[PDB]
Write a protein that binds this ligand. Structure first.
Ligand SMILES: [Mg+2]
Ligand SMILES: [Mg+2]
Ligand SMILES: [Mg+2]
Ligand SMILES: [Mg+2]
Ligand SMILES: [Mg+2]
Ligand SMILES: [Mg+2]
Ligand SMILES: [Mg+2]
Ligand SMILES: [Mg+2]
Ligand SMILES: [Mg+2]
Ligand SMILES: [Mg+2]
Ligand SMILES: [Mg+2]
Ligand SMILES: [Mg+2]
Ligand SMILES: [Mg+2]
Ligand SMILES: [Mg+2]
Ligand SMILES: [Mg+2]
Ligand SMILES: [Mg+2]
Ligand SMILES: [Mg+2]
Ligand SMILES: [Mg+2]
Ligand SMILES: [Mg+2]
Ligand SMILES: [Mg+2]
Ligand SMILES: [Mg+2]
Ligand SMILES: [Mg+2]
Ligand SMILES: [Mg+2]
Ligand SMILES: [Mg+2]
Ligand SMILES: [Mg+2]
Ligand SMILES: [Mg+2]
Ligand SMILES: [Mg+2]
Ligand SMILES: [Mg+2]
Ligand SMILES: [Mg+2]
Ligand SMILES: [Mg+2]
Ligand SMILES: [Mg+2]
Ligand SMILES: [Mg+2]
Ligand SMILES: [Mg+2]
Ligand SMILES: [Mg+2]
Lengths: 125, 147, 186, 66, 53
RNA sequence: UAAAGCUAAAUAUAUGUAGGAGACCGAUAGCAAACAAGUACCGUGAGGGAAAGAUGAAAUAGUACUCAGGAAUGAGCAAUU
RNA sequence: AUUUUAAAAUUAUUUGAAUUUUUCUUCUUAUAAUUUAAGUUGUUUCUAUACAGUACUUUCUUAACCCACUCGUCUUGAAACACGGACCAAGGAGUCUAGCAAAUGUGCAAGUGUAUAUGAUUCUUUAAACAUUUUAUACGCAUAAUUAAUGU
RNA sequence: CCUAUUAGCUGGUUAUUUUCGAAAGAUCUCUCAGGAUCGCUGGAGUUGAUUAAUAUAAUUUUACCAGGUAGAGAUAAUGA
RNA sequence: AUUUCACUCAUAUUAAAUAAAAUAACUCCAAGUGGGCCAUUUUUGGUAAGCAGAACUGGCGAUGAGGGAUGCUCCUAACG
RNA sequence: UUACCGAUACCAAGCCAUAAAAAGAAAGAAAAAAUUUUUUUUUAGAAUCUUUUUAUGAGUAGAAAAUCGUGGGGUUUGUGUUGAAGCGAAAUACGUGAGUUUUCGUGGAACAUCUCCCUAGUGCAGAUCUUGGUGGAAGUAGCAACUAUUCAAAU
């Protein structure tokens, strides 16, 4: 159903799973549009899988915000996070997956001095 | 570039754009120009009407260098001269230019257009037409035959 | 439901944007869109539209026809959204003022030797904001050879269309269907 | 096996998809094969009229520019 | 055939693949030719390698 | 100016041998064959014809000793890295 | 950051006329305020004097109530007593060349395209790039059509 | 080996969202399980309208025209 | 006939009504189709048929939702 | 004759996309908390762009645009023994969607580029598809010609 926390509204939370992916294991769950005569999902029979459509789209004013109510930016070194000193209230940072611990300590320490929040500041400790 | 080809848009569709009921088969109407005059007749008649049959005399060993002949009209005849040179002749009145068109690659002078009034000009060539030669004479010029 | 045609949606048919990636042409389009919007003059609208058309609808115009069109408009400015070419069939050229998109070297030289001048569209936008004493002209849009193949098919009665043939001669498509002597003409 | 051999079912729905088109309403038509001995005389009349008009216009031009 | 197109003419009905020739070394060969006719000049020892026509 | 004769260069090279290189393939791919490959194997014969790469820096470190068991093998307080 | 303005309504003092003769009677004929104009504002309590708890967010598992025939294909018509499919991993199908046209982008324009070659103080790359023979007739397409044809 | 001979005939033909949207009539064909051509559809482009107008209309009204089906007749023609 | 000059013929209520009438008109390049079937009314062959063959319109096909217990074509009504 | 129940159709309101429309290329201070000075938030101007308004949304064969991912190339600017690619289980995560991104574990040497471009042997559920591996059947069918075996001892 509809989920609403603050001013952010999500029209649906469940995923769209591929038709017949629960019955055959060679069929992966990622959504593919059904083509083919006599399908019962392409023809919108009641009681089966639903199709995704543009109607479920999100409000333009709140489209990429996290529950933090900020946008996400991914950084790879200390210098890449220079632009965040001017807009430190609309953005939060996340550290890339393949940076070492030594680099991560420096990134976290600078992010604290800039008053910007870090999403995942507990990895590799 | 294969990046931009149409077939990539049909890549998840069954029939690749050719149809469920009528397939894509191999030569379902003949090969090349096969069925003309039998079952391709309408196309042949409305797009290439005079196609069938023969007309005219034979010429057994042609040798095209015997009749080669490029032409020029009298319009482009004052334009072979530089503009500053064209200016000088229109000013002075007791001199006229003598132009040899064979040195420029033309063989026959042809008679379309209008020469300037009262501006004599002398033209050398291999062949002339009647109207061209009349127009050259009218403004006070002269034609000369060369070989 | 409801009984509309095209689900109530209005339809348009022409070209909507530039295709060309030339930066100077994009600057010109921006400038003349602004002029057309803020001074709706029916002169800037037509110009702003014409410099978006494809190549086949911006034909060249020669010097002789340029002079002939301006014969009764002395001390006026002619505006063309194509190119000007030279004409060796003219003997003499007058003094003219012309604005256009491109000039060929010979035409540009001939114009300036007679006391005239050549303008670009950013100069005409600066001196004639609303096109006072300016005359819009265009060249022949249906003189291209491709147009000689269009229309009624060659084979219908009384059609003027050219056919697509390998070459030209007595042996190439002149026998049956082109003379009464072989079963019918055309 | 036999088959159908005629129907014009669905033909005027196709006819009305792009409507019933109409003739063009031009102002002049060609007099190629129509009544002769009458249009040749008309050619002479129009040549005379054009001669008079052009001569008056040319004379006016000649005196105006002097 | 079906449209307003010119009637096809291509002369590919035999085994045409066996003799196709791509020219990958035209500039290499002109370098070689230039070097050979330059070598002849040093062997002449002053006299030219051209003849009067 | 026939019914006799000779002659270098500019041209070609899916063969053999040597050298260099690529917006090429990366062990079901690329030659059939990255390995004792026209080999093992099949057919009276003409002929047909595969599968199969990788411990570690070093084995000039490839598993010493004890207990149980006929052995194979297992376990350890015992052992290389 | 200047139309949530103007106007309209209301309330309390007013400048004048009506009539329906009145504590909602009319006519913005003068100033102030307010909203019924000009799309929701306020007061208390809890979460809580917390740092992850049994509370809140989230993902799985298992019930209920209503509903739900096997996909792909040919066919007027498929859940079919029509055919293919025991399962899983890798591989697997509109491409290349010639020749023509239309559309569109680019350059020059009565012209346009430096062919084969040659030249150079080009030579790892470079099999690329650069150049053109010290009133200027290589060739193609275009600049003129038409006829069996002498031709014009 | 020529040779990956040829098949108007069976089988298959791989990511998403958005927008528009059919034909199963007709002419010719050693043609009837095929093809070419018209019609139906998509995409490009120009000319127009943007002025509660004009062009326009699977609709009415006013004026005029053409018809031999339902019905009727058999004492009017023909045939019963 | 044609051509040139004079005068003049309702408009704002538009030479009768009404109109999400310009979503118009015209060129170019192409796809897929060319086995159909069903219902009311009209209608041919046949004793008749869920038989065979035509006409106008609406549908099924290409289309799901509520109702008819059930049902490709019936009734309401077409889909972010 | 009344009341009532009943759609994805009707009406009022929000949001997504599509189509059309009204405009825009000259820039300046608002609030709250604390005592007449401090502290927070904002102070905008990207033209296929930015504000605002109305109507609309079914689809086989078929057609178009925008977008997502793969092996290589040029350009820019990056990660890695303080652990790369790969793989397993996941997430108060983002997106209508294909998919991006991140955590813990295993692993032991390489891996990107979304700044913009170039290029192709570039995307699988089926073809009695090709090669390899593995099931239920199942501890089941079966281990029946040729007359026949027994007692004690050695190893
Ligand atoms: Mg979601
Ligand atoms: Mg179906
Ligand atoms: Mg489709
Ligand atoms: Mg198929
Ligand atoms: Mg068929
Ligand atoms: Mg709707
Ligand atoms: Mg001899
Ligand atoms: Mg010899
Ligand atoms: Mg090599
Ligand atoms: Mg191999
Ligand atoms: Mg139930
Ligand atoms: Mg049920
Ligand atoms: Mg069908
Ligand atoms: Mg059947
Ligand atoms: Mg089925
Ligand atoms: Mg059955
Ligand atoms: Mg079958
Ligand atoms: Mg089977
Ligand atoms: Mg695969
Ligand atoms: Mg072109
Ligand atoms: Mg074969
Ligand atoms: Mg539609
Ligand atoms: Mg069939
Ligand atoms: Mg009649
Ligand atoms: Mg009767
Ligand atoms: Mg329906
Ligand atoms: Mg019933
Ligand atoms: Mg739709
Ligand atoms: Mg590759
Ligand atoms: Mg990678
Ligand atoms: Mg290592
Ligand atoms: Mg492939
Ligand atoms: Mg598979
Ligand atoms: Mg047993």
């Amino acid at each position: 159903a509809v989920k609403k926390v603050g001013k952010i509204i999500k029209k649906r939370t469940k995923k769209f799973t591929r038709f017949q992916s629960n019955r055959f294991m060679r069929v992966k769950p990622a959504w593919r549009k059904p083509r083919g005569i006599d399908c019962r999902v392409r023809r919108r029979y009641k009681g089966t899988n639903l199709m995704p459509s543009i109607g479920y789209g999100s409000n333009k004013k709140t489209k990429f915000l996290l529950p933090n109510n900020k946008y996400k930016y991914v950084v790879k070194n200390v210098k890449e996070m220079e632009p965040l000193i001017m807009n430190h209230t609309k953005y939060c940072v996340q550290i890339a997956h393949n940076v070492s611990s030594k680099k991560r300590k420096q990134i976290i320490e600078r992010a604290k001095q800039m008053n910007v929040s870090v999403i995942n500041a507990k990895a590799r400790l | 570039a294969t990046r931009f080809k149409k077939n990539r848009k049909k890549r998840g569709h069954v029939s690749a754009g050719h149809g469920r009921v009528g397939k894509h088969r191999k030569h379902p109407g003949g090969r090349g120009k096969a069925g003309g005059l039998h079952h391709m007749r309408i196309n042949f008649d409305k797009y290439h009407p005079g196609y069938f049959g023969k007309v005219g005399m034979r010429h057994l060993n042609l040798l095209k260098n015997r009749t080669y002949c490029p032409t020029i009209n009298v319009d482009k005849l004052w334009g072979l001269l530089p503009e500053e040179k064209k200016k000088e002749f229109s000013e002075n009145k007791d001199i006229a230019p003598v132009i040899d068109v064979t040195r420029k690659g033309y063989f026959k002078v042809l008679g379309n257009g209008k020469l300037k009034h009262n501006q004599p000009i002398v033209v050398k060539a291999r062949y002339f037409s009647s109207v061209a030669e009349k127009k050259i004479k009218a403004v006070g010029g002269q034609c000369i035959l060369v070989a | 439901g409801i009984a509309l045609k095209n689900v109530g949606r209005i339809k348009k048919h022409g070209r909507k944007h530039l295709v060309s990636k030339n930066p100077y042409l994009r600057l010109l389009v921006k400038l003349y869109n602004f002029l057309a919007r803020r001074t709706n003059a029916n002169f800037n609208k037509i110009i702003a539209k014409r410099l978006i058309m494809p190549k086949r609808y911006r034909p060249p115009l020669s010097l002789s026809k340029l002079q002939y069109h301006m014969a009764n408009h002395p001390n006026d400015i002619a505006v063309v959204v194509g190119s000007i070419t030279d004409d060796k069939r003219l003997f003499s050229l007058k003094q003219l003022k012309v604005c256009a998109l491109r000039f060929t070297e010979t035409a540009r030289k001939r114009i300036e030797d007679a006391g005239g001048e050549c303008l670009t569209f950013d100069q005409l936008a600066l001196k004639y904001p609303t096109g006072k004493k300016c005359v819009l002209l265009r060249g022949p849009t249906k003189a291209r050879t491709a147009e000689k193949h269009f229309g009624k098919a060659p084979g219908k009665p009384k059609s003027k269309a050219r056919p697509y043939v390998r070459s030209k001669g007595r042996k190439f498509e002149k026998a049956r269907g082109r003379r009464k002597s072989r079963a019918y003409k055309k | 096996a036999k088959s159908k051999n005629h129907t014009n079912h669905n033909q005027n729905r196709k006819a009305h998809k792009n409507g019933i088109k109409k003739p063009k309403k031009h102002k002049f038509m060609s007099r190629k094969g129509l009544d002769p001995n009458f249009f040749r005389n008309q050619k002479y009349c129009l040549k005379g009229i054009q001669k008079k008009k052009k001569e008056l216009k040319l004379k006016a031009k000649q005196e105006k520019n002097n | 055939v079906a449209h307003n197109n010119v009637l096809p003419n291509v002369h590919l009905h035999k085994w045409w693949q066996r003799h196709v020739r791509v020219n990958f070394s035209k500039n290499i060969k002109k370098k070689k030719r230039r070097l050979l006719r330059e070598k002849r000049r040093k062997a002449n020892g002053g006299t030219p390698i051209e003849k009067l026509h």
